């Protein structure tokens, strides 16, 4: 038993919930949260942009001595992180970006990255202004994480569809 709530069951360990993944995990408290980020931890604008806001830039802080020490990341790569006043730990996950041509592929090894931690609160990785479907991310999603991850989706059109939509 978890303190998740109000999710929609899709498989054995895949969740989905309409719900803006700040407010989620400053209530939930999570032992991980995904940021969708980019491989120089540059938390701008979407999901990274809106988590490090609600960290005070402290994010972003740490963020900057991360790369300085250690260089960018791989597409299709991630790091954990402290997760501030979110979450016990951020893990940063750098899914492709299409509006920078990065290869779809790439979005399952991203995937990869949350079968390392038994469970997540995530948004769906490429989706938003990264680029890519948001219905292929989660089918990407459901294929290829085994433990247990808590789906948020800020739009509710998006989260209907996506619902709808789902084989
Ligand atoms: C602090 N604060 N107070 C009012 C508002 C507001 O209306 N919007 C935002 C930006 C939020 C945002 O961009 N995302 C949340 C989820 C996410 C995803 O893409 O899953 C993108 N922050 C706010």
Redo the contacts with the bound molecule.
């Keep these: 038993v978890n303190s998740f709530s109000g999710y929609l069951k899709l498989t054995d360990n895949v969740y989905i919930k309409n719900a ?3 407010e989620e995990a400053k209530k939930v408290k999570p032992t991980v949260v995904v940021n ?1 980020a980019n491989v120089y931890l540059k938390h701008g ?3 990274a ?2 988590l490090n ?2 960290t005070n830039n402290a994010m972003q802080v740490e963020s900057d001595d991360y790369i300085a020490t250690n260089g960018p990341l791989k597409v299709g790569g991630s790091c954990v992180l402290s997760g501030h006043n979110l979450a016990k730990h951020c893990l940063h996950v750098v899914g492709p970006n299409v509006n920078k041509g990065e290869d779809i592929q790439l979005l399952k090894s991203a995937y990869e990255n949350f079968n390392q931690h038994e469970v997540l609160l995530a ?1 769906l990785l490429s ?2 202004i990264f680029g890519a479907d948001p219905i292929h991310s989660l089918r990407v999603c459901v294929d290829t994480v085994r433990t247990n991850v808590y789906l ?3 739009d509710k059109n998006l989260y209907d569809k996506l619902v709808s939509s789902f084989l």
Aim: charged fraction near 10%; charge should be neutral.
């Design positions: 803006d993944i700040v969708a604008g979407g999901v942009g809106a806001k609600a948004p989706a938003g948020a989706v800020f």
